[PDB]
Design a protein around this ligand. Sequence first.
Ligand SMILES: CCCCCCCCCO[C@@H]1O[C@H](CO)[C@@H](O)[C@H](O)[C@H]1O
Ligand SMILES: [Cl-]
Lengths: 4, 182
Amino acid sequence: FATA
Amino acid sequence: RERAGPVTWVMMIACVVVFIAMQILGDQEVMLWLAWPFDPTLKFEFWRYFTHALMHISLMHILFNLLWWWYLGGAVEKRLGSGKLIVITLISALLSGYVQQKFSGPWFGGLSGVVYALMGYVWLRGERDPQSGIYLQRGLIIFALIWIVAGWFDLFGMSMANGAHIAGLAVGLAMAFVDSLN
Ligand SMILES: CCCCCCCCCO[C@@H]1O[C@H](CO)[C@@H](O)[C@H](O)[C@H]1O
Ligand SMILES: [Cl-]
């Protein structure tokens, strides 16, 4: 996961 | 009394429900269901262009994203109405996710692209349509710059969807420009  | 309208409310409930599901079922099982389409066979499951925004793996990010969602989305729903909040959310969610997956693939999520859109929108709409009754406080501009900057320079310790955040901001600016040609 890249978090936004 | 209540400051959060139905759309503000239902988005927070959904984010919480998904956060719980990720504890119970695991991050990956939920990502498989809710991620941006990560295969051509999945490109017609249309929910996935928006549902990435409901996923968090980090207690800190969900807290902060929901904090600014509650405050900025709440302001927008109260003053400009439910429909307006829905449209900024769907469009910012769609385009932020598009730019993010374009450059880094589909494994991402978080309400933060929508939050940056809302920041952009409330700011610019306040700046050049003062009579709209929406305004981004200076203290909040400061807080949002530090947060952005922390992300850009990897100070949080985790992987950051910088594409989605910057794309989200741009969308919210563009919509506010258009919305306030007047
Ligand atoms: C991540 C945050 C997104 C919003 C972009 C903020 C940049 C705005 C530049 O500051 C402006 O300067 C004015 C006085 O100089 C302030 O009164 C005004 O409120 C503020 O708009
Ligand atoms: Cl997160």
